[PDB]
Amino acid sequence: KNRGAELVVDCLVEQGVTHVFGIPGAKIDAVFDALQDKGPEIIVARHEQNAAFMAQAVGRLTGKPGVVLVTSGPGASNLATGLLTANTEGDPVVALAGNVIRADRLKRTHQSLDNAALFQPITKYSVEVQDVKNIPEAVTNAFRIASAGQAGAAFVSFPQDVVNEVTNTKNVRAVAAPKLGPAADDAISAAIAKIQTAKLPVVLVGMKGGRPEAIKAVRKLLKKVQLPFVETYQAAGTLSRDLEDQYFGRIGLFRNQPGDLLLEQADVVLTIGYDPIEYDPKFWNINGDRTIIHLDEIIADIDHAYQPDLELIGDIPSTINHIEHDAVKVEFAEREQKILSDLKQYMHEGEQVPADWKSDRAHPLEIVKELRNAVDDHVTVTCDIGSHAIWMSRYFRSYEPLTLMISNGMQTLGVALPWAIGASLVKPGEKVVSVSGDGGFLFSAMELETAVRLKAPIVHIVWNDSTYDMVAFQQLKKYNRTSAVDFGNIDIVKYAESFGATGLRVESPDQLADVLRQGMNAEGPVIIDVPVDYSDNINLASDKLPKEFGELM
Amino acid sequence: KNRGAELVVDCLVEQGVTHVFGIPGAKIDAVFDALQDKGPEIIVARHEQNAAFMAQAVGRLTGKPGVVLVTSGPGASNLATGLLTANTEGDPVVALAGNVIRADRLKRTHQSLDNAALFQPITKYSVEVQDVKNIPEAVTNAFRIASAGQAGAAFVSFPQDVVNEVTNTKNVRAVAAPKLGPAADDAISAAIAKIQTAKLPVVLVGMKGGRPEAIKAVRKLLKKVQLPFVETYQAAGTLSRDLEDQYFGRIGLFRNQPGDLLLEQADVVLTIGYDPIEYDPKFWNDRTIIHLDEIIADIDHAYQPDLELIGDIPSTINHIEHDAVKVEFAEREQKILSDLKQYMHEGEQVPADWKSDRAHPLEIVKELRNAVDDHVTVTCDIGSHAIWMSRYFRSYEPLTLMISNGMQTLGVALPWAIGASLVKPGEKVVSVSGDGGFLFSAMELETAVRLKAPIVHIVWNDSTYDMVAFQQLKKYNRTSAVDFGNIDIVKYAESFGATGLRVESPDQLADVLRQGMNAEGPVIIDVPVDYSDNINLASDKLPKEFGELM
Amino acid sequence: NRGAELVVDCLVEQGVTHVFGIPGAKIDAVFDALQDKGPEIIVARHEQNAAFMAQAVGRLTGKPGVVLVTSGPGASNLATGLLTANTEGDPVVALAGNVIRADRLKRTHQSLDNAALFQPITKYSVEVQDVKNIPEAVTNAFRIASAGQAGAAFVSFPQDVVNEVTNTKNVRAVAAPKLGPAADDAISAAIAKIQTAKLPVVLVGMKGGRPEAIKAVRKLLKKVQLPFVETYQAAGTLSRDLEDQYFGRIGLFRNQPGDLLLEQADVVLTIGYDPIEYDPKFWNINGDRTIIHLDEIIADIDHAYQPDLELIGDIPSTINHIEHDAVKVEFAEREQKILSDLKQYMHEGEQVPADWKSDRAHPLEIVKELRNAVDDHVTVTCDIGSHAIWMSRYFRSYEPLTLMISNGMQTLGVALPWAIGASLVKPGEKVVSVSGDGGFLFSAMELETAVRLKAPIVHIVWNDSTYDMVAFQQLKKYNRTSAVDFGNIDIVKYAESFGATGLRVESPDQLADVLRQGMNAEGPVIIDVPVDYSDNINLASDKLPKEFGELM
Ligand SMILES: Cc1ncc(C[n+]2csc(CCOP(=O)(O)OP(=O)(O)O)c2C)c(N)n1
Ligand SMILES: Cc1ncc(C[n+]2csc(CCOP(=O)(O)OP(=O)(O)O)c2C)c(N)n1
Ligand SMILES: Cc1ncc(C[n+]2csc(CCOP(=O)(O)OP(=O)(O)O)c2C)c(N)n1
Ligand SMILES: [Mg+2]
Ligand SMILES: [Mg+2]
Ligand SMILES: [Mg+2]
């Protein structure tokens, strides 16, 4: 027909977009109509929030922006949290929304608002197209800006008459966002010289160290040079089994981990793709001066606790390849060897169920271990936010890039199950596991109809506690009392069944391994009800370990 | 304790707030801690979206700002649509949110976000407090601005260190937002002269005509002067059983209603609390226009008032009422009223050729109306079911039919009914949605079960996003992205510990509804509906027919 | 019959007689269309001064001043102007070009997000994106600019929108409506609270200074015989008749007779008071008093401003309903002495010091000689600086809108362009403008406009060669000054280089003569007046409050 609506779909075609997540409405209608003619499969969502969470997951797993498409008013405003989360967690997303006609743009009329103004503080790019000719230009720049370091959200709004208008405007080439070269050579030399002269150099692998390419390079570096290392939560998957000896776990949330003590003992820290939002430098870069080398695709944020002595800004993996090429293996003096050894066995003992533990419910560590034993390396595991997620983020081993997905920017409740859906659409054929608590679960459980309608092979684990617990034990450590943390329990099994899904329940902690295998062998979506004992949770924020190791030294 | 958090709680005590809807988090948890000592009852929500909707319900039904309280980051950003909805539909709401400590406000850090900039476009008032001393001032101005005509949403954000900081700061008095006087008296006189000299003077009651005091005033005006009148959807309940004779239905959505032809035939139109968002003037609007409202009018190609009576709406109405006298109509205009009233009765009727194993929409509306007492509040969601409710479900009390008619936001029905039941203890509350919108906020059924709220939720079961579908069929002759698969509604209800009912055949409709009305605790009722008559809601038939009788 | 014509037609419907502007490419179609029909175009030398002029028209006529500019630097130069009007109750409408809609998101000459820039400093900031919407968007801009509280409205036109040919019809210029008075029972309440006061006082503020409000205020002050004070923008509330009940203009520093009056008051009635002129935390202090807020909009709650009664509605109507039903207050003995003492403190504070000697005029001598040289009805515009403090406290005004002060943003350089605006509003009358030397250069360029118009402006420069108001605050805080010194210029030959008339006061004794000589001159005249500023630190001095505190 050649409306503005067709120009939009043509862009999606040039961009190689396989799927569009959305919900139709009167203002964005022409575009949905034009998608009937061609373009990517439409995945109808049961909420624009979840549509955004789905696009985000696609962006994180593929490196090309996930696409979400919604109508005016509440269609658009329901995107806010989603885009915010994508934009602060390094995920390429492009959002396309409708608005009222240009003539009525300033009026009190149904579903009218300044779309671009709302999304301005929460995206890299937020625009509204006021001329049909401009559509291919605006859309193409949004894809590029979404993809360019640091990846985030782009939002593009269309008045209704703009996408309905007939025009002879030509499309433009989907010129892909270009790669940077590696960092300046002189900076790379300096960086190598500082690692070679260190008594205890260590690698801090961050958000953008967690991309597949970045991880491949990071592993060659760690293997050649033999550096100890830690991961941020979104760097999970850096580990391989033959790096386990050099691995000191995941830093974050509370300063009481072996990784923290290691970074403390370090005189040189090399950070890679490090976005401080995952764990503020004021928690780890303390207690003594210490050289900081910042390896990233964008310049560093200066902070009282973060003043890099060296910045290597360029393409992350290739910059790493250049350091790797000219570094050599680091020898550790006796003192540092013993520090490393001691940290390693504090790390080991942390991963164990307390010896005087007895219960009629599973311990969190038992859930974590059993889950890890029932799931092959290649399977993507998505995680929600809560105490369950602390246990997962610290103790759930991951061995491949993009196989453990955590929301460690906004810490947005409800991402797991929708993320699992997006993952299954990117990895057709594979099982996708999603893990949540019972609080965050109802934030997005509605999208179980999408999963069933798609016959997605998703396995969702609900940690059953019956409170907002991560908030509860923090309230106990601050005020020795809780507030607004309690809610009623629902029948998770019958909930799943009412959707046409499958419900299982761990009725005793010894059925855990069995019920898990069963979910994995099931056809279509499964929800698994797991009673958990959270009485150990308060110890997640303990200072015992920093204190013990303190008197060691 | 004299933290900033206590200063906040004290404002809520001073303001007479009985419920705060919320979800706790680290940056805001000091205010939640302070609520353990004194202050209103915390209602824990399963989604900040839904806490916002409930606060909207409280605001619409009491005139006092509803209060929602949330944490930083996604806690705040999840309020967006809620406050947008409230802000455009006339409901006083106060939102309170956390943010990161002042010193880290500029950094990439967990749950950080320029809160105030995000709500700037979608509220009357959006601010972040940067000094603990300023807390009582910023909160007290928020309540005032939320309530002041035209009522809307107010947003206040608090850095973590500001609510945790110990302080000597004094509270301020909750100075009530003041009412205006009536409109200028020479303006009132002018309007009385326009009505008394018109051939067919008519009243259009709008959004802010649906406040209880405005309705009581409007009824006296209608009865005394015997003017015909029409309702926007949010002015539902202006009608009294007494006034059914002068009543010409609800205007909205498509121009093809008896009310539309009436407004067209009128030489004078008195609009009361008319927010054009409910129905753009370019659809119903030569003739004289008298704009009566608590704020000045927006000028539009199709809306240029000859008279503006700006002041307190009920005051101004009374003044007009006091000095106006009965209008009597020439025979020409009586015939017009007779005909329009007749077209109106035909439209309210199930078509003659209708055959179906599912209920017609009108049969749901009729049985619902016949099963619910006039005083029972009925909330409604968004979709094809709501076109039917908005046009054909009669309301006779103020605030007993609640419709989202500024932002048309899916999912408002069930959370509104929860807010409503906390505002009217001892009463049943009815809510109506389609199956699409039901899953937008059905999570909150846990909350209704937790409170043992006497809610009866009716689900119109179709299996599609239909209101989108038949507009699509009319524009392109094909649908797109409107199909989803259905769930077992009864089992969905039972899994939450609520009661689930199902109308298995159209004749069971009366009894099943009755059963729901007498049930204990929350009830969900599955009601299959036949929508194949839905595309005629946008039909041009009636204006074409009436065109040639003239 | 383009979009540009639609814009000119709206200006005609609003009764706009003058448009202050500077042309550019993106907006020039509108400038074209103004050749055919419309209001006179006054070419400015800087978009800042065009904005100031507009503000002046708005303040003086009650209908929006109009300013028209091009895209990019044309529009951005408007920022301080609209901001100042938007915080001082002045209706202004601004019209600006932008790039074509197709190139709106591009890096291209003079492209910027116009609406976003003006959102935080206007009541109303919009961009039209369809030619049809022009009559609507503009009409609402005039009404919103006018609707109380009055201020700045900004409309932006992408270039292709005003050049586009259309058959769109215009829209009626529906006047912004009036409110009625406050509600009866509230009026009753206010009268009752006043009746039972031992010392009720009136505070006249910003919107108490419109002509109709002043007419009603004067009747109320006369009938009930209440003492009153003024905010700076409430100048001209006073009449010669009312000098007896008058306790001066409050503001800037809490050390004036008006402050002490307010402090002793048990009931304060405020009239159209915008706190920006003087924070309530400065006067509403040592003890409690009842506050009655009378205004066209609800009050801002403050730690030091929590009204017991709000009278919201049209200000002159509400004042009238109070005047009609109130009877005279009669002060007891204790309060009469109080009022008497304060009145003498007031009178002593207006006199040049005893041991004053100087080769240059003392400020009060400038204030005095200028007041006596100028008819009551003549409009006097004032700039910002130490000279303005002297003007604002001590220069009497007896007619509405004859003393204009920037008391919201305290914007430098407003005087001279405000006087240009005044003279266009009041043809055939002298207009006097007063500035310091520093603020003079902020807008002195616009003298070319005044000469080009043969405007009868008489501009007085207080010459001391420093940014003094900053400097003495710096000394009272830090015992040292910073960045307050600049060179000076020959004001007389400055004026002459523009084809204007330049006069100089070579000695304080020829002050009356050089002033009278300026009043009789044809065309613009600038006057160089050397001043001695050594007294200036005593403006922020703390003695009067202390001395009176011991007198109690
Ligand atoms: C959208 C949103 N609202 C509020 C919060 C604050 N918050 C963090 S954890 C949490 C509770 C999660 O509870 P649950 O999912 O049951 O996990 P659990 O701690 O019990 O394992 C809340 C409310 C948040 N992170 N996101
Ligand atoms: C939050 C939001 N998303 C999308 C829309 C667009 N929209 C309007 S009606 C509608 C259909 C709702 O369907 P349903 O609840 O099943 O009611 P039905 O039409 O079937 O009666 C949609 C998607 C909207 N109004 N609000
Ligand atoms: C645009 C602007 N810049 C700076 C200031 C701060 N300021 C206030 S008074 C003042 C000094 C003005 O001095 P001048 O005009 O020479 O008059 P004087 O103080 O000498 O009497 C300054 C710089 C201001 N108010 N406005
Ligand atoms: Mg839980
Ligand atoms: Mg449906
Ligand atoms: Mg000076």
Side-chain angles (χ1 to χ4, degrees), chain C residues 383-388 409-412 435-440 442 462 464 466-470 486 533 536:
Chain C
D383 212 271
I384 281 300
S386 283
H387 69 278
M409 286 293 299
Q410 296 166 297
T411 304
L412 282 160
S435 74
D437 38 40
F440 178 73
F442 273 74
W462 293 39
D464 88 324
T466 84
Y467 289 131
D468 190 272
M469 186 175 163
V470 180
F486 44 83
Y533 262 4
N536 285 20

Side-chain angles (χ1 to χ4, degrees), chain A residues 23-25 48 71 74-75 78 111, chain B residues 382-385 408-410 434-438 440 462 464-468 484 531:
Chain A
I23 291 172
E48 295 80 355
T71 194
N78 278 350
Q111 273 161 134
Chain B
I382 284 306
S384 291
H385 67 289
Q408 310 164 283
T409 301
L410 285 173
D435 43 1
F438 173 82
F440 265 81
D462 162 32
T464 82
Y465 295 129
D466 181 86
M467 187 174 161
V468 182
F484 46 77
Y531 271 163

Side-chain angles (χ1 to χ4, degrees), chain B residues 56-199:
Chain B
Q56 188 190 1
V58 176
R60 192 174 290 193
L61 289 164
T62 78
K64 265 30 164 157
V67 186
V68 64
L69 170 76
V70 303
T71 202
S72 57
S77 71
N78 270 359
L79 295 172
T81 290
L83 302 193
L84 175 53
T85 308
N87 199 62
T88 54
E89 301 188 344
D91 313 289
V93 178
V94 168
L96 308 163
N99 209 346
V100 299
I101 57 163
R102 287 169 288 190
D104 294 344
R105 75 191 310 268
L106 299 184
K107 295 172 182 183
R108 282 140 78 192
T109 192
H110 272 162
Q111 290 180 5
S112 173
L113 157 83
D114 188 348
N115 279 4
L118 181 63
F119 289 90
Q120 187 57 53
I122 56 163
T123 49
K124 305 186 66 169
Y125 174 88
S126 171
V127 307
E128 189 159 273
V129 194
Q130 306 296 354
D131 187 314
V132 75
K133 302 166 234 171
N134 183 221
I135 285 174
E137 297 164 327
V139 170
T140 298
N141 285 310
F143 275 81
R144 281 164 62 77
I145 300 174
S147 307
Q150 174 169 320
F155 174 87
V156 178
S157 175
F158 307 91
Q160 187 173 39
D161 56 321
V162 170
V163 296
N164 281 295
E165 164 170 357
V166 179
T167 188
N168 300 310
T169 301
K170 271 65 182 179
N171 203 8
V172 301
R173 184 173 80 77
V175 187
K179 80 164 197 141
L180 294 175
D185 271 33
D186 49 49
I188 309 246
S189 324
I192 293 174
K194 293 284 179 194
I195 296 159
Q196 296 287 326
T197 57
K199 314 128 194 185

